[PDB]
C-alpha cells in the first residue's frame, strides 16, 4: 500500500508560543521526551520551529530568546502526503522533523525522522 | 539487496573526550551540524553518548558536566549489521542514533534516524 502521514503521525501536537523562555522550551522537550517544538501564534497557526539543536545553539552562541533562535521558514507536511515524499523532503533540507499542518497552517501533528526510521524497520 | 550499516554510515566519526565542558560539546554539535556526539576514552573506546537533547536537559535541570549528563549504556551497531536491525533497535530503545563500533568498542562511524529516513525516501 501507500503509507500516508496520517497513518504514522504523532498527535496531539505539542506546541508553544514564541514568548516562552529558552529554559521553558528546554523543559517542554524534556517533559515530553521530544526534540521538536512547533511555535504557534495566538490562533494556533505555525510561526516557527524550535529543536534540541537550537537549544544547543543558544548555549554555544550566547543566544537569548526563542524568537531569535527559531527557524521561521518551516518545512511542513499535509496529512494526506505520502510518507516517502516527506522523507525525501527532510533529506533535501537536511532536517529531522516536519510539523503536519492543515490548509490554514494550524498544527495537527508532527512526523520526525524517528517515525520514518521506525516505519523502515517494521516493514523490514 | 540487504543494505548494511557500512553502506550508509557517516564517517569519519566526530567524537569527544568526557572532560570537555557542556558549552564545548554544544559548540561541536553546531560546528558539524550534528545532534550526536559519542564520548570516548583516551584509547578511542566508547564510554558514553551526548545528544542535543542532553544539552537541552542540562539547561532544563541545571546540570553541570558532560559526565553527569551523558548516557553510559550506549546502544551500538556493527558495520556488517543490516540497517533494518538497527532501525528496530532504535525504535525499541526510543533513541535517534547509534555509534558504529568495532569488536573492541572503538568508534568507526554513526548511523542516525536521519540516515535511515533518507534510505526510506530513496528506496521510495
Ligand atoms: C538544518 S538542521 C541540520 C542539523 C541536523 N540535520 C538536524 O536536523 O538537526 C538544523 C536546523 O533545522 C531546523 N529545522 C528543524 N526542523 C525544521 C523544519 N521542519 N523546517 C525548517 N527547519 C527545521 C532547526 O530549527 C535547526 O535550526
Ligand atoms: C531516550 S531518548 C528519548 C527522546 C528522543 N526519542 C531522542 O532520541 O532523543 C533521549 C536519550 O537518548 C540517549 N541516547 C541517544 N542515543 C543513544 C544511544 N545510541 N544509546 C543509548 N542512549 C542514547 C540520549 O543520550 C538521551 O539522553
Ligand atoms: C522529536 S522525536 C520524539 C518522537 O515523539 C514525537 N514528537 C516529536 N515532537 C513532538 C511534538 N512537538 N508533539 C508531539 N509529538 C512529538 C515524534 O513523532 C517523534 O517520533
Ligand atoms: C546527528 S544527525 C546529523 C547527520 O550527520 C551525521 N552525524 C551525526 N553525528 C555524527 C558524528 N558524531 N560524527 C559524524 N557524523 C555524524 C549523521 O549520519 C546524521 O545523518
Curated annotation (Swiss-Prot), chains A, B:
Binding positions (S-adenosyl-L-methionine): 54, 71, 75, 94-97
Residue ranges of domain CBS in the record: 9-65, 70-124
Binding residues for S-methyl-5'-thioadenosine: 10, 14, 36, 112-115
Signal peptide: none
Domain of life: Archaea
Record text on subunit structure and interactions: Homodimer. May form a complex with MJ0099.
Domain text: The C-terminal cystathionine beta-synthase (CBS) domains can bind different numbers of S-adenosyl-L-methionine (SAM) and S-methyl-5'-thioadenosine (MTA) ligands. Binding of SAM and MTA triggers a drastic conformational change in the protein, which evolves progressively from an open form in the absence of ligands to a closed form when the four sites are fully occupied.
Annotated family: Belongs to the L-aspartate semialdehyde sulfurtransferase family.
Function, as annotated: Required for O-acetylhomoserine sulfhydrylase (OAHS)-independent homocysteine (Hcy) biosynthesis. Together with MJ0099, catalyzes the condensation of sulfide with aspartate semialdehyde to generate homocysteine. Likely functions through persulfide intermediate.
Name assigned to this protein: L-aspartate semialdehyde sulfurtransferase
Organism: Methanocaldococcus jannaschii (strain ATCC 43067 / DSM 2661 / JAL-1 / JCM 10045 / NBRC 100440)
Lineage of the organism: Archaea, Methanobacteriati, Methanobacteriota, Methanomada group, Methanococci
